[PDB]
Amino acid sequence: AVGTVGLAVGYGRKAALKEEMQVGINAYALYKNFNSVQSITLAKANGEHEFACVQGQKTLMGRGDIIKETTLEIFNTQDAKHWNEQPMVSLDHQE
Amino acid sequence: ITSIALITIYLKSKGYLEYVNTSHIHDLAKFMFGISVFWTYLWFSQFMLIWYANIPEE
Question: Which residues span the membrane (chain B) (predicted)?
């Protein structure tokens, strides 16, 4: 929202497993008095990290032909031609 | 090209052309032949590239 930070908890294990599986941060040490909300100070570090990211682009370019959405009152009051429209091709001066 | 050839044939048969012979005719005949094949080439490639992947628009 604003002034808050998300932190996943549960990765920093080191006993009885290979270094390929010893990946991530634990954060359970921050669960003081079993409370999930903690006050913090955030500072920028020095280096740069590489991520195994699956998806590249974050937004949709306005391509309404991928996820068509509408509203309930449109669904209820308008014809399908105005919310679920299929593409047309020209014939002898006809669609 | 064919209209050029036809006029020179006419004029030659009427006795109005000199220094014109079958080699001039031959050269025009093979010229128009080659380029008529070229026309066919363009015709087919336009047709086939639409027919092969018939995305309904166009």
Answer: 31-51
| Interatomic CA distance for residues A77 and A71, integer angstroms | 10
Structure tokens at A28: 């359970």
Those residues whose C-beta lies under 8 Å from the C-beta of residue A38, and which sit 6 or more positions away, are: A30, A32
Method: cryo-EM
Name every chain B residue with its beta carbon within 8 A of the beta carbon of A87.
57
Entry resolution in angstroms?
3.4
Structure tokens at A36: 């999930």
Tokens (6 digits) for B52: 């092969």
Contacts of B1 (CB under 8 A, 6+ apart): B28, B31, B32, B35
Top residue of A86, A89, A91 to mutate, by most chain B CBs within 10 Å, is A89
The chain B residue lying nearest A95, using CA atoms, is: B57
Q: Provide CB contacts within 8 A for A61, sequence distance 6+.
A: none
Give the distance from residue A21's alpha carbon to the nearest chain B alpha carbon, in angstroms. Answer: 48
What are the start-end ranges of the H helices in A1-95?
72-77
